[PDB]
C-alpha cells in the first residue's frame, strides 16, 4: 500500500498502444490483422467535424463576441441559449477527435 501510491499520474498503460502484441496470435489471424489494419479511417470524423464547424462558425463569427462572455451571459434570454449551444457543440467537436 506504500507502493500503491499514485502511479497512474506518471504511468503509461502500454496495453492501449498495441505493444503487447506477443499475445495477439492467441485470438487474431494474419489476414484478419492486415484486413483489419488496412481499414482505419481518418476523413469521416473529419466530415462530421466539418459539418458542425459551419454551425459553430456561423454563431462564433456573428454572436461569438458576446456569446461566451460572462458579462452578456449573466442576464440574457436569447444569448445564454446560444452560449450553451456553442459550449455544447465544442465538446462534440473535440469528442469526435477523441
Amino acid at each position: 500500500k506504500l507502493f500503491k501510491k499514485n502511479n497512474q499520474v506518471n504511468r503509461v498503460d502500454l496495453d492501449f498502444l498495441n505493444l503487447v502484441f506477443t499475445l495477439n496470435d492467441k485470438d487474431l489471424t494474419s489476414y484478419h490483422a492486415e484486413e483489419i489494419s488496412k481499414l482505419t479511417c481518418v476523413k469521416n470524423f473529419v466530415e462530421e467535424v466539418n459539418k458542425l464547424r459551419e454551425t459553430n462558425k456561423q454563431l462564433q463569427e456573428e454572436f461569438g463576441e458576446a456569446s461566451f462572455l460572462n458579462f452578456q451571459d449573466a442576464n440574457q434570454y436569447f444569448k445564454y441559449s446560444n452560449k450553451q449551444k456553442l459550449e455544447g457543440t465544442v465538446d462534440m467537436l473535440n469528442f469526435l477527435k477523441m
Binding site: 497512474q8 503509461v12 503487447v20 502484441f21 506477443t22 499475445l23
Partner: protein, 245 residues
C-alpha cells in the same frame, strides 16, 4: 543527518564557458585534462547525434575515475538518463551475458512521451443491466453489461462499462452509495470509501467516510512523464500484471 560516503562533495566538473578548468572548483583539485575533456564528453552527450563512441578512463587507485564518473553523471543532470553498471554484474545464468549487455545498451537510451487520459469519479447510484425495451429477438434483453451511474458533486452522468472493469467493480465490493475512482483508458478501479451521506446509517463501521469529489465527472490532463526505452521493451516482452484472472 546528511550521509556522506566517499561522494557528495562533487557538484559536477565546474568548467567555465571558455573551457579552461579551474584549479579549485566543485570539489576537485588538479586534474585539468580529465575534467575539461570530460566536459567535452558532456557536450558530446548534449549533441544528441553521436553513437558508438567509447571512452575508457584508465588510471591507478585513488586517482579519480569513479569520481569523474559521478562528475559526468552530475554534470549531465536528471533529464539525461544515467545507468550505473559493473562489469562483474553482467554474468547471468537465466539468459546469456549478450542479452544483458545489449539489453543494457537499450537501458541507456531514454524517450519522453506526452499523452492525455480521462478521469471519471462519482458516487455509485445504480448497477443494473440495460433494457432498450424492444426485444428485437436478439436477447431477452441483455448480455451482462452494467450501466454505472456516477453521482459527482457538480454533475450526474451514467456510463456503460466492459465486463472486465465491472468484474473489478465486483472485486472492490462496492454498493449503492460508494465513491469509486475509474480510469477510462486503463480500466483500473480504486474505491475511496462510503460517501458522507451514509455516515449516519450505522454508528460504527470499518469503511471510512470520504466526502464527495469536487469538480465534474469527466476530467482530462496531460503528463510529461518520461519512460526509458528498455521499460517499453519489458512492456513489449512479458505480461506484467492485471486485476483479472
Amino acid at each position: 543527518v546528511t550521509r556522506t560516503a566517499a561522494h557528495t562533495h562533487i557538484k559536477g566538473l565546474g568548467l567555465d564557458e571558455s573551457g579552461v578548468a579551474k584549479r579549485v572548483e566543485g570539489g576537485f583539485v588538479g586534474q585539468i585534462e580529465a575534467r575539461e575533456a570530460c566536459g567535452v564528453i558532456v557536450d558530446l552527450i548534449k549533441a544528441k547525434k553521436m553513437s558508438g563512441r567509447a571512452i575508457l578512463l584508465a588510471g591507478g587507485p585513488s586517482t579519480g575515475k569513479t569520481a569523474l564518473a559521478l562528475a559526468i553523471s552530475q554534470e549531465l543532470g536528471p533529464k539525461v538518463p544515467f545507468c550505473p553498471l559493473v562489469g562483474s554484474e553482467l554474468y547471468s545464468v537465466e539468459v546469456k551475458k549478450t542479452e544483458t549487455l545489449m539489453e543494457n545498451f537499450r537501458r541507456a537510451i531514454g524517450l519522453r512521451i506526452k499523452e492525455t487520459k480521462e478521469v471519471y469519479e462519482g458516487e455509485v447510484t445504480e448497477l443494473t443491466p440495460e433494457d432498450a425495451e424492444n426485444p428485437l429477438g436478439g436477447y431477452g434483453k441483455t448480455i451482462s453489461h452494467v450501466i454505472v451511474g456516477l453521482k459527482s458533486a457538480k454533475g450526474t452522468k451514467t456510463l456503460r462499462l466492459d465486463p472486465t472493469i465491472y468484474e473489478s467493480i465486483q472485486r472492490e465490493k462496492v454498493s449503492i452509495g460508494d465513491v469509486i475512482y475509474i480510469e477510462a483508458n486503463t480500466g483500473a478501479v480504486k474505491r475511496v470509501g462510503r460517501s458522507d451521506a451514509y455516515a449516519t446509517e450505522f454508528d460504527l463501521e470499518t469503511e471510512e467516510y470520504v466526502p464527495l469529489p469536487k469538480g465534474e465527472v469527466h476530467k482530462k490532463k496531460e503528463i510529461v512523464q518520461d519512460v526509458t526505452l528498455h521499460d517499453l521493451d519489458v512492456a513489449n516482452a512479458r505480461p506484467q500484471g492485471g486485476q483479472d484472472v
